[PDB]
Scaffold this active site. Structure first.
Site, PDB file in Angstrom:
ATOM      1  N   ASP A  34       0.883  -1.154   0.000  1.00  0.00           N
ATOM      2  CA  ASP A  34       0.000   0.000   0.000  1.00  0.00           C
ATOM      3  C   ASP A  34       0.931   1.216   0.000  1.00  0.00           C
ATOM      4  OD1 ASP A  34      -1.663   2.218   1.587  1.00  0.00           O
ATOM      5  OD2 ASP A  34      -3.146   0.792   0.849  1.00  0.00           O
ATOM      6  N   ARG A  81       2.064   0.942  -6.817  1.00  0.00           N
ATOM      7  CA  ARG A  81       0.675   1.311  -7.053  1.00  0.00           C
ATOM      8  C   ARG A  81      -0.038   0.385  -8.027  1.00  0.00           C
ATOM      9  NH1 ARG A  81       1.412   4.829  -9.211  1.00  0.00           N
ATOM     10  NH2 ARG A  81       2.227   6.967  -9.080  1.00  0.00           N
ATOM     11  N   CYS A 153     -19.033  -7.382   3.699  1.00  0.00           N
ATOM     12  CA  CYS A 153     -19.082  -7.472   5.152  1.00  0.00           C
ATOM     13  C   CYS A 153     -20.472  -7.954   5.537  1.00  0.00           C
ATOM     14  CB  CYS A 153     -18.803  -6.107   5.774  1.00  0.00           C
ATOM     15  SG  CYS A 153     -20.027  -4.868   5.383  1.00  0.00           S
ATOM     16  N   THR A 154     -21.478  -7.401   4.871  1.00  0.00           N
ATOM     17  CA  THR A 154     -22.857  -7.809   5.121  1.00  0.00           C
ATOM     18  C   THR A 154     -23.058  -9.216   4.605  1.00  0.00           C
ATOM     19  OG1 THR A 154     -23.921  -5.607   4.998  1.00  0.00           O
ATOM     20  CG2 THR A 154     -25.307  -7.515   4.557  1.00  0.00           C
ATOM     21  N   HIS A 180     -25.921  -0.444   9.653  1.00  0.00           N
ATOM     22  CA  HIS A 180     -24.462  -0.501   9.548  1.00  0.00           C
ATOM     23  C   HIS A 180     -23.759   0.657  10.262  1.00  0.00           C
ATOM     24  CE1 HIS A 180     -20.745  -1.864   7.707  1.00  0.00           C
ATOM     25  NE2 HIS A 180     -21.393  -2.720   6.936  1.00  0.00           N
ATOM     26  N   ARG A 235     -26.740   3.880   7.733  1.00  0.00           N
ATOM     27  CA  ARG A 235     -25.435   4.106   8.339  1.00  0.00           C
ATOM     28  C   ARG A 235     -25.678   4.861   9.644  1.00  0.00           C
ATOM     29  NH1 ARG A 235     -22.395   0.773   5.185  1.00  0.00           N
ATOM     30  NH2 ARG A 235     -20.500   1.845   5.907  1.00  0.00           N
TER      31      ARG A 235
END
Lengths: 335, 335, 334, 335
Positions: A34, A81, A153-154, A180, A235
């Site tokens: 990264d 990158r 994630c869900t 969330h 959210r």
């Protein structure tokens, strides 16, 4: 033997998947790339966390500012990158976790082969990449596959949940809504956002109706459910942890006490470890650190009758998903 | 006659500044530019806010993909990224407000001039621009300087205060500290922050401290207090408003009351509207939308002796500061 | 081997419990609290928010007023008036007054009636003798049965100042403490007949709160008297606070000179009390830091070798809940 | 015709109905009485409000001890800890808004009559008293019924909705999942809450799943929909404004466009003031200070199929409700 993988993108899931790696038996982190994180920062980042505390399970000493002697074992650090440039092979990474977030297209995530990566698991939904949800369709995997999407994630929550209730009571049609927390894509103050006009508002001082695809996604993992489900999202000002809320009109008349025993016997069953069962007055924080995809709050739920019910399932968007990341490589390597 | 100006960067300060002009009757916003907020995403912005209530002082409708129309008085919008390449002269920007937290260097901000803008006023202490603080040195201005910076959310608070105490007591030293709210410069969750590590941590979940040049940045606005000051800050989970913790030591032995009487009799006419005085068990939120550059908490403040005291000053970093801009510019044009 | 008891099972009360159970120094035997049931306790103690869930060792109910922390049982009371808690009948020698309603030497001495040898108040006491750990636990003889362990704040600012004072001598200073909200802050704009500000939104404002923790320093460190005093800001966070102490010293010394003076202090005579960290850390970075004070190297700023701002952190809850047990360890060795 | 009111619960909900009355060109606040808050302290809480902005309308001065003096008009103060002795009429108050939420029982709130009280509106459901949700069943109030309840911050939203939908399409069944903003019933830090365990968890930093018969309540103002509705709630960290994530199953297959135009058409009609219609990309706060009992968010909702839809309508619990309270009085008298 340990499956050597390469973490690309050192974000939240990006190192949480790291943290879950360097602390195992069948997997080993050997390199992370990264460009926006110098090694002298990459340690600090990894070491301290607002949500998961201080590391300390191996010590962290930089070897030669481009390495990172992660206490005994080494871990090459890159700042390449372009994914086609990163030299994975040379370092030694059969599988590459895709935790950078800007290469969901089967191709932009395939640029990892070049460098040398054998298999690359995209750690995010995919517009055209095999989505594999542990405990649901990870079975339906074949060797030759080299690019997989580990869902969202869900999804890894809704799907197992849906596969439970469905295989038992068959979901007719059903709307889902998930409360969330907030991720790295929300501002802290009303700022600019060309995609989620609304998400471009202070994330810590509002409730925001960010649309989802998770359910339209369950159409991938579970075919039969394709079309029977959809939904949205809300959210909220919470840091970690999140919660699904599937409301379905099952096609097999049954009570709440029966649907609860279902998940349960399913949480102690094949799905043991993916879908959890909990019957106790809890609150978001108490799930921070939960290695399960979906937790079933049998007390939070409610049922209007034996043909229309609402089920609530907890889930650490960060931790749980990050486990679903390695757990899949664990599967893609046993095949 | 009715100074025409334009804002470069519609961030929090942009819309907020505009709100002071499109409201004011002695200035007339004419052209805006935010290469990220396309016209459409601009109306929804300038109108609905999360900290200073909805906008209800002039209808907001888009006449066309290139010109808004606030309160039936058209304004233009460019999608230009590079400053200089912005035709400021075409709308009628006798002045331009550079609020992007980036182009804050004489040359950088000096760009505009190319498009036309006869003047550019940076909204953040510049490295090579002469900062001013309405209520201190806003006279050290001259019609021969085009690029200029307008202090910072804090400098505009410490300055007028240290002003009244130095004008009425004698500042030997004295340190500062600011329990300052979040900003669109911080991340929501632990995130990479190139230059500001601490700042790369969860915004509304940590007591993230950080340095603030504003300290001895006031050693420029009030050249007399050279080094005699300095300090740091603490970013706490608050969308707006902020307070100053000035622990000053003085020479002319004075009582906390001989101060209040001053800071008030200094707000009653000398820096009236440029500094306030309140004696009430208030809190941050009570100050939302306060045009005063710096309010004084005649109560919260404490004194060790008639020579070593602690003074507290509340300020709406966002809103207030703004009015200093459309006051400075307002003033800047008189000279 | 040292049996104790806690009245009121609040944060500190529970965390002071989490200590005695995981320690091999003190043992928990009694727990008095009328507002929470035995059945409710085994939940207010288990799953937590700021300090996570307690998985360390299995919990289980035996039969009311009886509780099993693994295999070791604890008597659970509900009596409302202190003077009616039969501590002596359970084995609790020291009654930790962690309730925040009994702070009078007189008031918290109601345990002494229940047959408890001594009572340790978990907060300031207008009259009971105050002793801060690492500062003056020495100023305590086996004759005072009503003591105080100062405050979450004083247990931090105390050492930090003494350390500076002994080395560079303090002339005069002031302090600020951006402290986290607590049990006595309303969730939304509500009443508070003593602290009006302290009534308004807890996590939506920045509540300025009176605080004489600096004023208290004067009592636990004589020569520092009258030369200290500060205020506090109650910002939106669940835990951990900071001490902003701007102060003048008699012996002009470079900031590094304090750093090592500080750092070398937190490396022997005060190790486990004060700390020294030189990394870009924050609030959540210190959740569980059992220290009383934790100097932040790269944090405070100096205005010269004669007027500097020393800042230190301290988990108001855990760092303190730990020092309470530490002041019972001392009284237990006199 | 001025309707003289009397408050017995000066809190977030008490002060507000006062603000609403002082501005209601037809109502008169003549007596407030939250025993804990005194004539001195009272002014503070009424003047400053962390949420709903500082009070700027009147002037408010203190005429003597036992009585305020809001803009020329005196308001007898009370510190009576018990209803059986609050001289309502002795100060003049046909109606007594019961805002303590500790006297919701008809007989418990009837202790007001014994003081010179006529009607008494309980701003909180009653186990025995009658429920009325303005715009819905305010039809069934009869001069005799002296003690009445005013549904709830929540019901006063789901009813306007569930009605404008059932009337136009008829609800077969449906579940509601509201996201409420923490209230005084919570604790700031993990504290005791024996009647609602979860609730006592860190209110400012958690996702506490509560319960609310608000959905099962509508079967009281909407006789038909009895047992056809239900649902639990989520208390995410905010302060005001909330949402009703209503999942239903309608009779007459009607496309989403139509459900939007159905809410709207009737949002301007016979429900003007109760229902609202937002077709913008708004968020939480934008609804602050909106007297509507339930604003419909056209863009938030999603439909699976023309019979199973998910409508979402915001409502500013605290403020929005507050009005309905008064309104029932403007009605309780006019009949």
């Amino acid at each position: 033997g340990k499956i050597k993988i390469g973490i690309n993108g050192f974000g939240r899931i990006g190192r949480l998947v790291a943290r879950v790696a360097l602390q195992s038996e069948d997997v080993e982190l050997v390199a992370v790339n990264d460009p926006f994180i110098t090694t002298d920062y990459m340690t600090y980042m990894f070491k301290y966390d607002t949500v998961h505390g201080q590391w300390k399970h191996s010590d962290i000493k930089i070897k030669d500012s481009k390495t990172l002697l992660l206490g005994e074992k080494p871990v090459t650090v890159f700042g390449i990158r372009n994914p086609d440039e990163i030299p994975w092979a040379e370092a030694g990474a059969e599988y590459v976790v895709e935790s950078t977030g800007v290469f969901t297209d089967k191709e932009k995530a395939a640029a990892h082969l070049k460098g040398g990566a054998k298999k690359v698991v995209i750690s995010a939904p995919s517009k055209d990449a095999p989505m594999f949800v542990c405990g649901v369709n990870e079975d339906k995997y074949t060797s030759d596959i080299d690019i997989v999407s580990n869902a969202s994630c869900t999804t890894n929550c809704l799907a197992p949940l849906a596969k439970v209730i469905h295989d038992n009571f068959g979901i007719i049609e059903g709307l889902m809504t998930t409360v969330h927390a907030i991720t790295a894509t929300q501002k802290t103050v009303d700022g600019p956002s060309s995609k989620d006009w609304r998400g471009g508002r202070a994330a810590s001082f509002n409730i925001i109706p960010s649309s989802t695809g998770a359910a339209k996604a369950v159409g991938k993992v579970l075919p039969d459910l394709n079309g029977k489900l959809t939904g949205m999202s809300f959210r909220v000002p919470t840091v970690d942890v999140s919660v699904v809320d599937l409301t379905v009109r099952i096609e097999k008349a049954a009570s709440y006490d029966a649907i609860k025993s279902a998940i349960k016997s399913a949480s102690e069953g094949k799905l043991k470890g993916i879908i959890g069962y909990v019957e106790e007055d809890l609150v978001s924080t108490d799930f921070v650190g939960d290695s399960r995809s979906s937790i079933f709050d049998a007390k939070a739920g409610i049922a209007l009758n034996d043909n229309f019910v609402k089920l609530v399932a907890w889930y650490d968007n960060e931790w749980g998903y990050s486990n679903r990341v390695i757990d899949l490589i664990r599967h893609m390597a046993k095949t």
